[PDB]
Design an enzyme around this catalytic site. Structure first.
Site, PDB file in Angstrom:
ATOM      1  N   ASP A  21      49.161  54.076  60.319  1.00  0.00           N
ATOM      2  CA  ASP A  21      48.286  54.029  61.185  1.00  0.00           C
ATOM      3  C   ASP A  21      46.923  53.522  60.894  1.00  0.00           C
ATOM      4  O   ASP A  21      46.784  52.402  60.600  1.00  0.00           O
ATOM      5  CB  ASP A  21      48.035  55.615  61.598  1.00  0.00           C
ATOM      6  CG  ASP A  21      47.090  55.725  63.008  1.00  0.00           C
ATOM      7  OD1 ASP A  21      46.343  56.740  62.977  1.00  0.00           O
ATOM      8  OD2 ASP A  21      47.412  55.074  63.817  1.00  0.00           O
TER       9      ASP A  21
ATOM     10  N   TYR B 224      37.417  54.500  64.338  1.00  0.00           N
ATOM     11  CA  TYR B 224      37.547  53.800  65.616  1.00  0.00           C
ATOM     12  C   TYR B 224      36.102  53.156  66.340  1.00  0.00           C
ATOM     13  O   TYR B 224      36.347  52.244  67.321  1.00  0.00           O
ATOM     14  CB  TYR B 224      38.059  54.803  66.767  1.00  0.00           C
ATOM     15  CG  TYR B 224      39.513  55.176  66.577  1.00  0.00           C
ATOM     16  CD1 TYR B 224      40.590  54.634  67.214  1.00  0.00           C
ATOM     17  CD2 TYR B 224      39.828  56.347  66.023  1.00  0.00           C
ATOM     18  CE1 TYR B 224      41.694  55.020  67.173  1.00  0.00           C
ATOM     19  CE2 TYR B 224      40.992  56.978  65.851  1.00  0.00           C
ATOM     20  CZ  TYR B 224      42.075  56.160  66.368  1.00  0.00           C
ATOM     21  OH  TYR B 224      43.279  56.756  66.462  1.00  0.00           O
TER      22      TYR B 224
ATOM     23  N   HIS C 191      55.492  58.429  66.522  1.00  0.00           N
ATOM     24  CA  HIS C 191      54.392  57.796  65.858  1.00  0.00           C
ATOM     25  C   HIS C 191      54.290  58.383  64.344  1.00  0.00           C
ATOM     26  O   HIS C 191      53.738  58.030  63.444  1.00  0.00           O
ATOM     27  CB  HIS C 191      53.067  58.220  66.694  1.00  0.00           C
ATOM     28  CG  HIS C 191      51.798  57.757  65.711  1.00  0.00           C
ATOM     29  ND1 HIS C 191      51.475  56.621  65.491  1.00  0.00           N
ATOM     30  CD2 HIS C 191      50.578  58.475  65.587  1.00  0.00           C
ATOM     31  CE1 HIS C 191      50.488  56.542  64.833  1.00  0.00           C
ATOM     32  NE2 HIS C 191      49.951  57.864  65.069  1.00  0.00           N
TER      33      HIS C 191
HETATM   34  O1  LIG Z   1      44.372  54.273  66.048  1.00  0.00           O
HETATM   35  C1  LIG Z   1      45.843  54.271  66.270  1.00  0.00           C
HETATM   36  C2  LIG Z   1      46.268  52.824  65.551  1.00  0.00           C
HETATM   37  C3  LIG Z   1      45.085  51.703  65.032  1.00  0.00           C
HETATM   38  C4  LIG Z   1      44.429  51.379  66.213  1.00  0.00           C
HETATM   39  C5  LIG Z   1      45.249  50.031  66.576  1.00  0.00           C
HETATM   40  C6  LIG Z   1      46.074  49.613  65.270  1.00  0.00           C
HETATM   41  C7  LIG Z   1      45.802  50.625  64.251  1.00  0.00           C
HETATM   42  N1  LIG Z   1      46.660  54.926  66.637  1.00  0.00           N
HETATM   43  C8  LIG Z   1      46.514  56.236  67.245  1.00  0.00           C
HETATM   44  N2  LIG Z   1      45.583  56.561  67.966  1.00  0.00           N
HETATM   45  C9  LIG Z   1      45.668  58.091  68.142  1.00  0.00           C
HETATM   46  C10 LIG Z   1      44.985  58.834  68.875  1.00  0.00           C
HETATM   47  C11 LIG Z   1      45.659  60.169  68.851  1.00  0.00           C
HETATM   48 CL1  LIG Z   1      44.743  61.274  69.715  1.00  0.00          CL
HETATM   49  C12 LIG Z   1      46.565  60.520  67.881  1.00  0.00           C
HETATM   50  C13 LIG Z   1      47.304  59.662  66.927  1.00  0.00           C
HETATM   51  C14 LIG Z   1      46.794  58.341  67.330  1.00  0.00           C
HETATM   52  O2  LIG Z   1      47.283  57.185  66.511  1.00  0.00           O
END
Ligand SMILES: O=C(CC1CCCC1)Nc1nc2cc(Cl)ccc2o1
Ligand SMILES: O=C(CC1CCCC1)Nc1nc2cc(Cl)ccc2o1
Lengths: 323, 323
Positions: free
Chosen positions: B110, B241, B299
């Site tokens: 992630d 983020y 995920h």
């Molecule tokens: O934030 C990412 C991945 C990154 C942003 C784009 C590529 C790397 N994924 C991501 N957004 C989430 C939001 C929640 Cl609430 C829970 C798990 C999550 O995983």
């Protein structure tokens, strides 16, 4: 031969490992490669390893600088029994368990020297190669108890002075700047009368109230050892000396046993408490023994001759330990 | 194929390493051999590695389970800027400095996946082999900014919802049992409407107040992640983020650069945010790429299919990383 690279506290990796609910051993870690655990003596700390720590890492070894039970960051249980050889040794194995280390080269000094010797006697599968600074390996005799042994040699009277709980503490805790400035000194710069410590009524009674700064250590280094003992104090560190009956019996439970793993004994010529002649007959019980000797070296082996120690240690690890 | 060996918190070795006066990164360490640093994603912890941690150690590797900046034991500086790629990446190198590790295999997932990718782009001398779970390697395009990119794909609207400081925090912090029970779930057990998170006025507004316990995690595990975020909270974790402009420009400072170290991308079929097709053209920028794919995996890759992950990771380390 200027003093080698040292260790700055806030620039280290501090690891912590609980091995019992009430016991948490701390340590500093640096380097990659074969695990090499460094254990100090009384009343030192992981800091006394500051010269050999970065060098050992430099030579290709993982260095786990132990902050031995009772000292500093580590837990300090006021109970005497919590410092008998057996417990302390067993916790070290547990220390390896938690970290997931099948084996580890154990290098100690002074009390940690005694420690790593027994860790080689009762737990060979756990020790890759063992090395001791100043402390020789004397197999406890069944017929003779510590009673008439610590009372055989005149220097050891300081230990009988240590036995009584709280007595040596009040003194040792009284002035940490003095206590440590008075202790950490080369032989030629002595002050301590390890002659009649009990008759004198202390170990500092016959010494300057404001001793000078030994050529070995700086003011800052002394201030580090001062802030370190401002936590636990000395009861813990001193308790190591208070479990003689136990350490005797426990050591008898091995009798005709010999250390068969690669061992290295480092004698320091000018050390008067741990004289190099005490290790004389070690060759017998340890058929795989290699020797080391440092000229003009006092008791505080690492601070005294850091460039020599790192030369001997490294040379020995790369051939016997490293495999 | 029952769930493999896990990790109990009080039976671990907790290391700490300050890399800046106000920043101290924590981690768990187990095993001996080539250093392998594990980095989680948002909003995980080192715990999300509990299945691959003991296995990696078991396979003959040293495991440094990172408790990524902002999360748990690690320092959490409220400033957004303290979480931009550049800073976070630079601190990792510093992390290696302090521990005295010339290189280290970096495996992330992630956000930590994004992390370890850049740690392979700008610091090759420091990374032995790089591996990412779910997060593919997309080279920032000069002409297109995150503005019209995160607004191109409909799922990413949750991120725009994250930008505003404090908004997503109040919700995410409101109920930690719910928040984490609602999140940690296999795909078929979803609840989260990553459709229109902004129009909905939250990410949980369209979900049960008392979601069930996912088949992946136990109650205790959820309680661990609950107590973990009771310290720093979410501002830190969410800040990752919030530095898109910076991460964009910083990434442009490399353009025609390619990752030439052994790399492994692990795609998870059922992951809807990080769909396996995003990694499609990675082969180009990484001429030394090996692939991995896990069927029926959501995920939360490690919790979802722990036996699969450990099979792929170990097999890849022993051939490409281990050397
Ligand atoms: O934030 C990412 C991945 C990154 C942003 C784009 C590529 C790397 N994924 C991501 N957004 C989430 C939001 C929640 Cl609430 C829970 C798990 C999550 O995983
Ligand atoms: O007491 C020991 C070590 C043990 C002797 C036999 C096995 C280890 N040495 C020892 N006693 C000291 C007293 C002072 Cl004041 C300072 C340093 C000392 O080192």
């Amino acid at each position: 031969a200027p003093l080698p690279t040292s260790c700055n506290p806030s620039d280290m990796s501090h690891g912590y490992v609980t091995v019992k609910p009430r016991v948490r051993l701390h340590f500093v870690e640096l380097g990659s490669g074969p695990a090499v655990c460094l254990c100090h003596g009384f009343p030192e700390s992981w800091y006394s390893w500051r010269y050999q720590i970065p060098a050992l890492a430099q030579a290709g070894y993982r260095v786990l600088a132990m902050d031995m039970k009772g000292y500093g960051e580590s837990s300090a249980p006021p109970e005497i029994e919590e410092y008998c050889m057996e417990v302390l040794c067993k916790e070290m194995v547990t220390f390896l368990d938690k970290l997931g280390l099948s084996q580890a080269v154990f290098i100690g000094h002074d009390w940690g020297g005694m420690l790593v010797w027994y860790m080689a006697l009762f737990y060979p599968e756990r020790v890759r190669a063992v090395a001791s600074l100043n402390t020789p390996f004397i197999p406890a005799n069944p017929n003779m108890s510590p009673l008439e042994s610590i009372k055989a040699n005149p220097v050891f009277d300081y230990q009988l002075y240590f036995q009584e709980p709280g007595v040596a503490e009040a003194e040792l805790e009284q002035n940490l700047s003095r206590t440590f400035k008075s202790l950490f000194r080369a032989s030629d710069e002595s002050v301590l009368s390890m002659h009649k410590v009990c008759e004198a009524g202390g170990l500092f009674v016959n010494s300057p109230e404001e001793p000078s700064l030994s050529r070995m250590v700086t003011e800052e280094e002394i201030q580090f050892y001062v802030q370190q003992f401002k936590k636990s104090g000395f009861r813990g560190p001193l308790n190591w000396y208070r479990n003689m009956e136990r350490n005797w019996k426990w050591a008898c439970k091995s009798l005709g046993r010999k250390i068969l793993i690669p061992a290295l004994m480092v004698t320091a010529e000018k050390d008067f408490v741990l004289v190099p002649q005490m290790s004389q007959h070690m060759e017998d019980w340890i058929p795989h023994l290699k020797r080391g000797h440092i000229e003009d070296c006092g008791h505080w082996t690492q601070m005294d001759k850091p460039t020599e120690v790192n030369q001997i240690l490294i040379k020995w690890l790369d051939s016997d330990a490293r495999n």
